Amino acid sequence: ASVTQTMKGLDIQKVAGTWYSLAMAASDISLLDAQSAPLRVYVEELKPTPEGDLEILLQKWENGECAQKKIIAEKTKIPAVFKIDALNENKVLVLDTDYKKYLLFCMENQSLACQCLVRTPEVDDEALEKFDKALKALPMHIRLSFNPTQLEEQCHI
Amino acid sequence: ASVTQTMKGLDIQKVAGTWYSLAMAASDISLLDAQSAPLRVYVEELKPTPEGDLEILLQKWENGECAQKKIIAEKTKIPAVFKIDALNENKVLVLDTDYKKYLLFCMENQSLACQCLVRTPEVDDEALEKFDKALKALPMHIRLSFNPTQLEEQCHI
Ligand SMILES: CCCCCCCCCCCCCC(=O)O
Ligand SMILES: CCCCCCCCCCCCCC(=O)O
């Protein structure tokens, strides 16, 4: 269940800028089933702070409407692991990224969701291979992927 | 998009009896998202009629409740292809089965959903491999799998 793959030698400054949530998977179906499931979040932009923390802009459907949400991930001892304040303190692990095209990540509390991010609104078969193979290891029960048209809309409608 | 894998030399009498919908995937996320999505159907039992048609018992969530539904699939020229009466006349294709453990199928109208069925409430990694690899070919955007506990409940709650 635990995630035991992280990016060796991650430079968090190089993941700054725009991303698309091409695909997402989670351990429990109810975390992603509906448009307003808890972890159905669409990534807009990564903004690393100078002090090394990560700021995230994303979209989340709630109250029948697509909201913008800004969120702050705090660094830890490990460069590929970050921390998000909540009801219960969640972890974000960076699995892999080539900076220029794709980045794979997971978040944990036991529950768990992961995502394949890409720089452009295109179906990258390669990044998807890598995403599937990192997931093989994990106990997933729901997976979503989206098309180029959907990737350009708010909340992937 | 089209399904171009079918079981060679299918004997429809040998798939009679009990099955579990271990996993399901579809081309559009809305066909499977909610408990009452159109193609979120859980297979209970296969009953082949003497004249070669297939009778299916299944469970479908609707009106906030888990209903039993009986359904009838009519044979065609091809042993692995069957036909279900509806608003629009749908096809059911049998991709693969070893009769004793697993059976993979898809249904078509363009929309498309497939399933990995198994005889017992157990996670069969093998049948899942075969399911993933038959799906590789197809344009899927939502996938669900269920655990042994869920497999014994009505509507996989
Ligand atoms: C390094 C890139 C990681 C991107 C992580 C995105 C953060 C997702 C947190 C999801 C928690 C729900 C958001 C909320 O509504 O508060
Ligand atoms: C050979 C085994 C094939 C099993 C096929 C199951 C039939 C699924 C039909 C789904 C259509 C919706 C059912 C309904 O509510 O009318």
Author numbering:
A (entry chain A), B (entry chain A): 1 to 109, 115 to 162
The authors write:
The new lactoglobulin variant carrying substitutions L1A/I2S at N-terminus (sBlgB) has been produced and purified by two different protocols. The sBlgB purified by protocol #1, based on the method proposed by Ponniah et al., had spectroscopic properties corresponding very well to milk protein and crystallised in the conditions typical for natural protein. The space group P3221 and unit cell parameters of sBlgB crystals correspond very well to the trigonal form of natural bovine β-lactoglobulin. The crystal structure was in agreement with MS results, indicating that N-terminal methionine has been successfully cleaved (determined m.w. was 18,211.7 ± 5 Da, while the calculated was 18,213.05 Da).
Bovine β-lactoglobulin (BlgB) is a small protein (18.3 kDa) belonging to the lipocalin family.
